[PDB]
């Protein structure tokens, strides 16, 4: 328990009382938004894991925040449609390729966008659209498709492009697993029905 009293109060209010969060997050130099427990979840992550749209919007109002991608993934894994809408409305997704391309290869990923508690992430190759297809959330798949998120079809098994060889050289198991994940997303009835004409 290395967290201070004020941040602990703010975090427990976010997990459970909108007025307390509103008072703590307004006109206060302290109580950093992207603070989390020693081994717990972020304020945004706690506000998204338990359905509360207004607290999530208040948390996302801050320009600088962390674990936005993990919050989106956790919301998508369940039927939290409005939370997903609010998170996608954040300018971070609109002004970046974070929405479309996978966390593993989106960028140099210096910032912890999709990062989980300490080191892990779901697999790094699973995009929000692929996760929505896996869980078969028709509304979420439709929303992500309207935002431009499409599952990229994996190359042929005998592909000889530079990227395929580079992924095959190191961690061929991860390459096979990511291919299976992409095909699981593509073969999803939700993605099949909502993604193309003549499905």
């Amino acid at each position: 328990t290395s967290l201070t009293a004020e941040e602990e109060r703010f975090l427990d209010a976010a997990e459970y009382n909108i007025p307390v969060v509103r008072k703590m997050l307004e006109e206060s130099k302290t109580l950093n938004v992207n603070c989390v427990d020693y081994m717990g979840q972020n304020a945004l992550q706690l506000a998204v894991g338990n359905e509360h749209l207004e607290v999530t919007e208040l948390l996302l109002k801050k320009e600088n925040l962390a674990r936005i991608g993990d919050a989106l993934l956790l919301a998508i894994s369940k039927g939290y449609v409005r939370i997903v809408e609010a998170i996608l409305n954040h300018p971070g997704f609109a002004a970046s390729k974070r929405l479309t391309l996978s966390p593993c290869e989106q960028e140099l990923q210096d910032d912890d966008f999709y990062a989980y508690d300490e080191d892990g992430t779901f697999s790094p190759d699973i995009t929000p659209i692929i996760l929505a297809a896996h869980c078969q959330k028709y509304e979420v798949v439709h929303m992500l498709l309207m935002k431009g998120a499409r599952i990229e079809r994996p190359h042929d098994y005998f592909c000889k492009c530079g990227d395929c060889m580079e992924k095959q050289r190191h961690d061929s198991f991860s390459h096979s697993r990511s291919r299976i994940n992409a095909y699981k997303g593509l073969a999803s009835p939700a993605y099949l029905s909502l993604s193309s004409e003549d499905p």
């Binding site: 190191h170 961690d171 061929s172 198991f173 991860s174 096979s176 697993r177």
Partner: protein, 140 residues
């Protein structure tokens, strides 16, 4: 995972020894095997798969073979690693058909004395790596 493997073996031995509560001990050993198989199933990187398949030389695979933990050895995460060593130093031959493999067996049968006598220099040659792969040993 090592604790669960050892406990599974111990519970199987107890099931053999008792014969009264054999079903109880067999159910417990199945619980241990299921735990090991699930922990292996969670792996999503080569580093994790290797760490599970051998501890801190496929040690855990050999232990599971010894302890008849059949679902752990037959899991795809273990099978892909086993095929990696199996088809070592020969990548294209993995994708060949069964008929091509039979033709390779026939060629090896015809030329076994020649490669055997050439083995005196093969370790210094490239063909030594080819013949020293486990698949080529099995074919020989």
């Amino acid at each position: 995972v090592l604790t669960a493997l050892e406990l599974s073996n111990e519970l199987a031995k107890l099931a053999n020894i008792e014969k009264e509560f054999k079903n109880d001990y067999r159910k417990l050993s199945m619980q241990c095997k299921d735990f090991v198989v699930g922990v292996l199933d969670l792996c999503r990187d080569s580093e994790e798969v290797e760490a599970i398949l051998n501890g801190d030389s496929l040690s855990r695979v050999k232990l599971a073979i010894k302890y008849e933990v059949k679902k752990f050895v037959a899991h795809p995460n273990c099978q892909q690693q086993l095929l990696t060593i199996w088809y070592e130093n020969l990548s294209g031959l993995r994708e060949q058909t069964i008929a091509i493999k039979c033709l390779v067996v026939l060629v090896v049968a015809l030329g076994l004395p020649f490669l055997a006598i050439g083995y005196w220099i093969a370790p210094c040659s490239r063909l030594g790596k080819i013949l020293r792969s486990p698949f080529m040993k099995f074919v020989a």
